[model samples]
Structures are given as C-alpha cells and as structure tokens.
Target: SPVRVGLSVDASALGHTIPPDYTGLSYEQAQMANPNYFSGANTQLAGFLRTLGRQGVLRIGGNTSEYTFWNRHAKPTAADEHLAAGPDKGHHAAAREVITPEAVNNLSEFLDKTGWKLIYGLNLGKGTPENAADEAAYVMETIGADRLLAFQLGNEPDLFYRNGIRPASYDFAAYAGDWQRFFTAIRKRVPNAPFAGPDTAYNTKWLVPFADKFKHDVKFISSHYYAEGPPTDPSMTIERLMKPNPRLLGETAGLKQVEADTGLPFRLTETNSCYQGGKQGVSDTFAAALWAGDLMYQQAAAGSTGINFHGGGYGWYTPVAGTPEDGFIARPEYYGMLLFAQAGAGQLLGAKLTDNSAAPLLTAYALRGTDGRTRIALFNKNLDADVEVAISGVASPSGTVLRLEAPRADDTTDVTFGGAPVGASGSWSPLVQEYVPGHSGQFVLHMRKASGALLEFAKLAAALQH
Candidate 1:
C-alpha cells in the first residue's frame, strides 16, 4: 500500500485576489535597443501574452538599467557613452545602446496593445536625478499614468557596494537619501507618477528603512530574489532546486510586517531560480516547473502581493525562448506559470496536510472559488516513488484532475500540462478529465514523482438530503 496523506480545506475562509496581473516577467533595459520587441509588429509576442491572459506587469530594468541613457533625438550620439559602464559593473560600455524617445513611444503603444502595464526603471547608479526625472516625465506622457504601474529608482541598489557604484560604507541611510532625491525630482516633474523600490537583491534589511521612511512616497515595496546563484555553483542539483526554500518564507514574513505597518503591498519585482542568466539543466527542466509553481504558492501563502520571474536574451530560465526572426518557444518554466494561470483563478483557502510527515517530497495548496468550488494543488517532488493521496474535508458529485508532467524531472524538452504543450504559435489546449469518484466523502489520487496536479471538486451536499 502507498503512503496516504489526509488533506483538509476550509472553504468559508477567503484570502487575497491573486490578481490577474499576479504573474510577470522582468527584462533587461537593453531589450529597448530593439523597440520591435514590444511594438505592434511583434504579432507572435502579442499573441503569446494573450494566451497567458496578457494582464501582468512588464518590468523593463535589470543590471543594464544603470548604464541606460535616454536619447531625446531620433539619432544616437556619442554622448550616450558618457556612462562608460556595463551591467553588474562598469565593464560593458554603456554606449552599446541608447534609449531613444521613439523606443519609449513604441513601448507605450506596445503596452496598449498587450493590455499589460509597465514598471519602468531609471538609471540611478550612473545617471543624475534630473535625467531620471526627464525619463519619468516622458514615460508618464507616453505610457499614460494608467498603463505605467510605477517607476523603480534603481535595480538592486543593495549590491551597490560590491558593484563599485557606491562606497563600501554605503548603507540604507544613504540609499534612502538618494532615493528621496530622485523621488522629489521625478514627482516635481510628474506629480502623479508613483514609485516602487528599493530593488535590493540580497540585503533585504534595506526594505525596512525604505518602508518605514518612504511610507508616504512609495506606492509599493519591491525587492529581488534568486533561489540559488552565479550559475556556476557546483552544489546546484535538481534535488536541491526542488526542495523548499526557507529564505522565501522568512523574507516574506519580514515584508508582511512592513506591509501591515505601511499599508502597502510588497512584490518580488525581479526573481528566478538562478541569477546570472540561469543554469542550463537545473533552470530549464521539468524540475524547474515544479519549483516555479511551488514557489509562487509559497509567496502567495506568505502574503506577497505578486512575483515577477526574471529572464531574457539567451538565458535558460526565460519562459519564451528564441528570437524575433526564428520565433519564440515556451520553456518548461513557462508551463509552470501557465499551470498557475489556469488554477490560480480565485482566493486562496487554508489547506492543511495531515499524515504528510512521512512524505517530505510533497507540497500542497488550496484555493476556493466565489461560487463554493475548491481546488487542491499538489506537487510530488520525489524522484523515485509514487504515492497515493487520500483527500478529505470536501465532497463532490464529480471532480477533475489537471496534471503537469514530463517523462522525468530532468527532461527538458517534453514537458506538458493537462496533456498538451503550449504550441509554437503560443496556443495551449489542456487535456482535462474527471478524476476517480469520491468514496465516503473522500477521494484518492495516485501522484507520480516529479509531477503536479490540481484537483477541482464541488462542496458536499447539505445534511441528510432526501
């Protein structure tokens, strides 16, 4: 007999909306070098986002943000090279690309077409407040205050000391001071332009001062996260990547306190499984999809307002791979997000996993719909064994199971959800079916290793139905 776990769900209880725009992608500032990436001409790109509901934020900033220069003229100029710096440091010359007014205008139109909002980042590391103010004003004018979500003052300011952008002694006080200057300058130009920051990568402590001091100035608190790092760490493994991240809950606990105090939502504005692009096998396999879905639920349960998984260029973690000419393909991580988009439709419910102590490889979540239906999301992280799950606390005339699976956790290419992969044209049609019927107000499911599923069932009928 397989191990059994009793699942409980509280349907009357309700939680956050899990906003339609809850899912998001973070791109490097250099992507603006080619405006067509977002322009209307990118039909395939537009269609792809539509398939994912096209209601998430498109954050335009990353390491390349510090080196970006806005070109008011239609043509680029040598003055654009004044930054003399690159991403993660002052290595790649900033002159390689220029942020032209046309690109900004086109981006605005692209957002209009995609129905997605923007969280634009400014060049605070190497650019002045006046310059940032100018870009803020232009962005507000072009994207409109409605489509432009908020302006991030910088990218990962906490890393400034190591990046050589600030003195080794640079601290939160100095960061807050600089942030206030930019906020004042931008607000002076565009009074209604809202802001989100301190975009810190590792030093989460910076968020405390930022939230406490800038309470009135900020629209939302933001930060960055990576479950692992540098992509070259030898310790990275599918098993390690699949395990629960203790830091996620800890950071969210801290931010949740700030959220209570400041009355502002907090978001992981930039994040992924690995930094510096991502590990080829670890970040690009079925294991990553399992990790991604589980991580999203972890954040949601911990009270995070939202999460943006970062990826771009030829990076392995990017949801959509390939280029404009060759077209793009959805990676395994994309399937993970798609799974979330499908089942993450309503408020979360309090789910309890009893008799699960013996099954450390399993993760579970519950969400209840406004109409009284309930969804149980389960992930089997074990690599070698299959387990039978006994679910209780609800009854239904019928139930459906949507499974996310692959040949193996290490498989990179054949991942599928609900029996289908997202088409190359960005279309997804899930295979759905009725699960085994309930037996005495409970149901049993055979969960395979390294896979996940959503069990949707109806509430039990009233007492002693004739």
Candidate 2:
C-alpha cells in the first residue's frame, strides 16, 4: 500500500505563514572580519544570500558573542582572536574577538545590499551594560532599526558558568539582574530598541522564567539546539544524525508550551546537526542537507519565528562556508535551505501522513503558495529504502517535481537542487523537468533514498471546506 499524504487546499484555511526570513544563517560576532568581510561590496557573499531570498535574517551570535567586545579606538583591522581558559572550551572555541564601530557600519551596508535583517548579539559575559548600550546606540544609528530585527542579549547565557564566563553561583536569578541592567541601559540610549533573549543553550528552564519576566520587554524568546553534539564523541556518526530525533520532537512541543504561556514566539536562533564545530563526515554531508530541510519544515510547522544555522571559521555545519578573501560555496546544507526556498513563501498547509509510523524516515509538507500553486515537499532521509506516497487533498493539481539530490548521503561536493548545482554566483536553474501526471486527482510520488522533491502544482484545487 502506498503511503497517504493529505492537505486541506482552501486558500482561506491555511496554517502558519512560515516567515520569508525563516531561512536564516548564524555567524560568530567576529565573522564580520573587523569590517570589510561583511561589506555590501562583497557581491560574492551577498549573491548566495539572495539565493535563499532577499528577505531573511542574519543572526550574529554563538560562542563568540560572549567574548566579543566593542573597540571604539584605532582603525578597524582583522579582529584580534584570543583564547580563554574553561573546562568546556572544547577545542578552545571560547576564543575571544573584538568588534569595532566600523564593523557595525559595514554590517549595515551588508544588510542593505542583501535585503536581510540583523539580529545583533551584544556581549554580556565580561562586558558592562554601559558598553552594551554604547554599542547598541551605534548600531541603531548605523544599521537603523528598520534593518534590525532585534538585539539578542547574549549567546547561551545558561552555559556561562561552565564556559568560564560567570561564577559557579551564577544562575537565572543572577542572570536576571544582569538582564535588567542591560535592558535599562540600552533603553535609555535607544528607547524603542527591539530586544530578544534569554538565549539559553539547551535549558528550557531559563526560557520559561526568562520570558515571563521579559515578556513585555522582548520581541521574542530564543534557544539553541543541535541534534547531536561534541564532535569528539565517537558515537556522533552520520547514521545517528540522520535518524529520527525524538528528543527534538519533545523539545519543540515544550517550546510551543513556552510560547503559549508567555504569549511570545520562540526561535532556534542557533542550531545545526552537531555541536562543537560539528562531526566532520556527518555535518558536511548531504545527509545533513536532508536533515536540515526536514528541520525547516518541522520548525515552521511548529510556528517558529525562524531558525539560524550556525557556522563560522570553516566549520562543517555552516551552510555557507569560506572567508571573505576566499570565495564562498554552497555546502550541502545550503541545498537543503535552497530546497525550502524554492517552494517560495506563503501558507504552510497542515499535512496528514502516516509515513512516520510506517516508514519513519520519510517526511512531507504541503505549502499553498501565494501564487495559487500548492507545493508538496517530500524528503527521503532513509538510506536503505526509497519512498512512494500517494498525494491528494487538492483539485487536479499539475506541475513538475524538482529533485534535490546527490550521489549519496555522504557526498558533499556533488549536491544539486532543481537538477543544477547552485553556482558560486548563487544562480540555480533547473535543466530537467519531470511531470508526474496524476490520475483521479492523486499524484504518486516516488522519492529516491537520501534525496528530496518539491511537487509544484500550478493549477488550483477546489475550495477545501472547513
């Protein structure tokens, strides 16, 4: 029996509007590379961002945010990187860097060029509120509030104690005191500056109480997640990263509760398949691409504000890799995001499917595009079994299937979306068109293993009744 996929096709009865900015990338505060690295003049990087969509977000945070400090003096040069002592330094990633006013200016231009918004992270670990406000004041004047999404207070404050940023006694109560100070200082400088926090690593405990206290203050709440962690862990294999993550399902459910309780939306501001620079083979492979595409659908379905895939300094998990001096390339993970972007934006239809219980490794999502087309996104993450599903729930929809595929799950360089590799210029075009004609208003989709497809029906279905 073929797996059944269903969705309500009514234009009026649609689910969440999966924000156009949902395809966001997170970088360290220092990725600005002093100033020139993130400049608008860097057409190479901006082109790739345009590939995702003009409207999106660029979250600047992660481990480096805690160490980044404002440097007002001297000509801006390559940020000074230094190491700090900590038990969980984990390859000494707790390295510090400096950000200058010129860097902020460059950031503004970059956002303008790419039509992207900024979620700037201010230093909180060893910095003072006065300094944070000083920087915030500069950002408002430079980046402008129109281009700024929100100012994130810090990155993963809950782990400060272990990361050598705070005392062992530091906890939520202690952190709250610090938050009040930063909020007050920044508010005094920029009265209407948008704020978002508590930016915890994995602790939901920090989120609930933090949002309750700052519910009226923050633009939204945020947390970070990695399907697996510590590249040093021997068990962090490609198979483990590709398998179904029940913990993620459980956490997302809890995050929804947080949103309901606080009347605030939640975002995974920094997330990827593996933590601590990511496991090499797993994070850099096409398997992670499939994993990431599935995650975008999963989170958007959960009503998330957005997600930012974290990467910096040639890390494996970063969808966009390389430096400003060296041209960047779309890693396999970028193709996953590209897969989601190709569906375009509009409404995410509530899909009903039993493949999870049966096939387990396959997942599907239906998007009712604003153009009157309904797109059914299918991801086949199972390496051993190809998937076949009968898709219905719309009028005799007709369009082609855009396949996102590679040689295999572990293949990194040979990935393609819409039958063509995205060029360094960030240009992607489909060379092949596949038309799967359905009979009796049902389209049969056969998804090859370790790949994905976007079924676009240019025709509209009959009005679905509530």
Candidate 3:
C-alpha cells in the first residue's frame, strides 16, 4: 500500500510556532516539594529533558494536587478523598505534603534550566479560594508569567463525585460555579492569571459545557484520558493497547467541535497508557512507545494545542523512569513522544494511504516544517506483518529514516531509536541513519510491525487542493 502527503494545509493543521513545544510532562504537585528534584542543579535530569525537547510544558498536578499546601504555618487539608478506591487508584500518591517557597524557587530554576514552561494545578477539591489565590500569587511571582503557561484549577473534577472528592450530586454546573469562585479569588491578588480547566477524567460530557461557559475565561480547554485502565484488569494487554479506539478518538472529535464553536484550543493536559498508574508489561514496554507516539500525531491532527503525558517517580507509564536520587531514564513511552518530536515545528499536512484495509494497525502523519522540510511519521501496531508504504508527492531526491524499534512488541527493556538507547543521562543522538533515494517523486518505506519510523525530505509541494 502507498501513502500520500497532501499539499494544502488546513487552519486546524497549522502549529503555533516555529519548532514548537507540542510535547510536555505532567508530575504530581507533591513531586515539586522534593528539594533534590526540579532544581537547576539536577544536571542529570535537565540533560535528559533537553534531549526530550528544549521547550516543552511541565504540568504540576495530579491526584496529589488535591491537597498540596504552599505555606509554612498551616497543615494542608487532608481531604476525605480515597486513594484509588473506586475507578481510579494505582498512581495515587497519598500524603499531607506542603509546597514551600523554597520548592517554588527551585522549580523556577528548574524551568529555566530545562527551557520548559509550567502549567501549575491548584487544589480546589479542599482548598479555600483565598489559599488558591495565595498559592497562585507565590507561584506567579516566583515562576513568573513567562515561565508559567497557565494554571489548571483542579485535577479531574468530573471524577470528584465518584472518587469521594465531592458529593454524589456534583456535576459540571457545580464545578463551573466553583471554578468562577476560585478564579474570582485568584484574580483578586493575581490579576494576570492565565488558566485552563475542567481537567476531566474520562468524561466527554463536560467538554462542550466547559467550553460554552468558560470560553472567555481560559487560555485553553483541557481534559485527561487513560487509554486503558485500572492497572488491575488482567485482560489489558499490549495487543489491547495497540488496538484502535473509536471511543478515544470520539473525545478528540468533541474537542474539535469545541474549538470550532468557541475558538478555544484544547489540550490533553493529563493522559497516559493506562489510568490509575499503568500496566506493567504493557505500559512500560516498547508497545507503550508506539501507542503513545501514534497518540501524539492523532491529537495534533485533530487540532490539539499540545499534550502532557502524566508521569511521576517510576510510575507504571512514566516517560522517564527512576528518581533524582537513583537517576532517571527514558521509558519506551518517552520514546513514543520522541517519535513525534522528530516532526519539528510547522503545519500538519494531510496524509492518507491508498488502502488501509490490509493493515488496520497502521497510522501515518505528515508535518511540513518551517525549515523547508516535510516529515512523515509512521507507526505499525500490527503484531503479525510489516507494511510496505510507498510515500509520494515530496519531490526530494533523497531523505533519511529514524527508526523506533524493539526486540518484540512486549519487550520491556530492549527498545532503541536511531540505533541506540536514550541512555541514563538522557543524551541521545541518532547513531545510524538510512538515507533513501526517491523514485519519480516517491519514497518507499518498509515499516516493521510493532515499530515506528520517521522520514524526512526536502520541501516539495504535493497535489494542490481543489
């Protein structure tokens, strides 16, 4: 089968900047308090982050954000929320942790060293309006507006009712009311607040409503998605993770409509391989890399501003595993986002295959870069057969291929990209490159199943859209 790149670009396909920060990392609010981490002095971690992408977003929030405090004299409200009791758990980090000015100061230095922005999540589940404003004021002063992209008021409020964060009668109406109340308080001291919210967990029902109500108040609309879940489900497998999910795509489709209706960009501020932590063999392996890489392309093509993969200290599906004390390493899922990072910054061009019936596991994306290059990212999730994809319409004489591969689909430790592992220091460079010579304006890619590849060619126009 052959794949083709479209010449014209849609408004939805255009990216925000040249060489964009379309990828991001999400850590729990409590993680910020670990003085050893999130500091400019964390050279090992910062090196890895620079290798990941120089300008990405680092989100601070998760279940832990529900009660993290930022003061000296008071104890944080240890809310009645249960840890992974009902539909969510596994990834829950329980503690009455407090955020200090000392931590925020180091966080500012961390963002400076990483060149990544911040999307801080405030505790609204149990925190008062005044405290939210107080925390916001400190963070804004310390991190500054340039480093802080926006603030997410809550973490997965839609699950509050079920997770014991709120009462059974809680809904979007009540959530929105609280949002306004919090925003009002926040605006009082910190008048220059840029925010995004509804940070839902698996609920598409709140998106349109959140958009309708908060369109004028937010920097972007945000939510969360866990492709597979509970981590305790024995039925969740690598094959299941690789399988096509209309339900997930449907949520993106809903986001597209919200963008069309309200013109507010959407972001999956929190997402990962599985909810409530992740599965061991599936979420941590090479399968996760392929799954996550394809998801980035899918979200970008659907008009997502960007995505932040929710990760933490050795969590099941964290992009980088280990800790500041033991050291950090890029997981297979981190390589997944790395695949899309190769696309660079530009506009998403339309890409389609001649026939997709033979390999339903295959997905493709095209991005025409600002540097006068067109790139193609291909992922084949099929377990059985490799797909012969002949890409045409780019008139370059030759191009290069960067491979994302592993020993097998479920292999936990043997993944490599461009012929090398990311290394413990996060210093990775393509060790091997396969140069391709095009034929009659076409390029052939023999993509391996359960693997991914990125192809880059000099800029050349395809068939112009009629």
Tens digit of lDDT per residue, candidate 2, span 23-50? Answer: 8888877565356667777787788888
Ranking by TM-score: 2, 1, 3
Tens digits of lDDT, candidate 3, 1-466:
3332222223244453323777888888877556557878788778777777867888888887886776744333332211211112534435666676767788899999889999998989878889899999998999999888899888989878876779999998999989999999999999898999788886888998998888878888888878897678987889889886766877777788888888898888988888877888888899999999998888887788888888867778888866666777888898877777666777777676656676788887777776767787888888776888767666776889999999899888888888888886788888877998886767777877788998888544444624
Tens digits of per-residue lDDT for model 1, 1-466: 5667777766556666677777777787877766656667767766666666558888888888877777666574322322212123223434446788867877887777778888999988888999889989888998998888889988888878777778998788888888889999999989998889888886767877788898888889998878876677788778888776666656777777777877888888988887767887888888888888887877877777778888765577787765667677888888878778777567897777788766777888888754557777888887766778877766676678889999989888898888888886578887655576886557888888789997878557734655
Where in model 1 is the C-alpha error above 4 Å? 76-96, 370-372, 432-434, 439-441, 458-466
Give TM per candidate. 0.92, 0.93, 0.91
Q: List the residue pairs that clash in candidate 1.
A: none
By summed lDDT, which 10 consecutive residues of candidate 2 come out lowest? 80-89
Runs in model 2 with CA error above 4 Å? Answer: 1-13, 78-90, 355-358, 460-466
Query: Model 3: runs farther than 4 Å from truth?
Result: 1-19, 72-93, 459-466
lDDT of each: 0.77, 0.79, 0.79
Q: Give candidates' CA RMSD values in order.
A: 3.9, 3.9, 5.1
Ranking by lDDT: 2, 3, 1
